[PDB]
Amino acid sequence: STSGIGGDVRDIEETHPDFQPRLVSADLAEDEIAMVKKDIDDTIKSEDVVTFIKGLPEAPMCAYSKRMIDVLEALGLEYTSFDVLAHPVVRSYVKEVSEWPTIPQLFIKAEFVGGLDIVTKMLESGDLKKMLRDKGITCRDL
């Protein structure tokens, strides 16, 4: 037993699995929840704006997930979208970069901006529009 104490602590080091877990599957890997996949690391740098949702923007699975795509329509700009339920890389990245995830959730230029409650303040203040206009982009504005 650990008993809240130790000596020589069993020293572990992060590398991605070479074999399966037995009779119980896992969605997260020890290297993967410490470093994002290099194809996704280039993708977040290749996009100017990224969002992830309960489902897909044509078929949302939550009311708050729908409300975000209607707020993207209120701005007249839509951004590059991923389903948190289909691939566990999405729920892993959002947890690691934002600390505490609340979906649907938004990122700009590989940096964390906010959940729907926060995006709402930024959109309702024109503060979201300041950054997208600094990126040379035209939105609907209110």
Side-chain angles (χ1 to χ4, degrees), residues 34-52:
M35 182 168 64
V36 78
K37 178 184 180 179
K38 289 288 183 174
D39 174 82
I40 303 300
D41 174 83
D42 196 59
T43 300
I44 62 181
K45 272 175 283 192
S46 161
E47 295 306 298
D48 289 308
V49 192
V50 180
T51 199
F52 16 64

Side-chain angles (χ1 to χ4, degrees), residues 68-141:
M68 180 68 81
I69 315 306
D70 255 349
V71 164
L72 293 188
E73 195 277 306
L75 195 66
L77 293 174
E78 216 186 85
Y79 305 129
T80 300
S81 52
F82 302 90
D83 181 1
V84 305
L85 304 180
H87 303 307
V89 66
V90 185
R91 87 174 195 247
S92 305
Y93 173 77
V94 68
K95 187 192 186 304
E96 273 285 301
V97 198
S98 73
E99 201 82 287
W100 314 120
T102 321
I103 70 179
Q105 195 168 342
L106 238 169
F107 281 70
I108 296 177
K109 299 193 68 59
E111 202 167 87
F112 176 49
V113 163
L116 180 62
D117 291 85
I118 324 305
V119 173
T120 301
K121 319 191 182 179
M122 290 174 174
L123 188 258
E124 293 276 62
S125 310
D127 290 331
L128 208 176
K129 155 280 207 79
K130 193 170 61 172
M131 291 85 72
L132 87 88
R133 187 60 173 265
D134 197 59
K135 191 53 274 192
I137 308 169
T138 299
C139 63
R140 295 177 178 291
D141 191 68

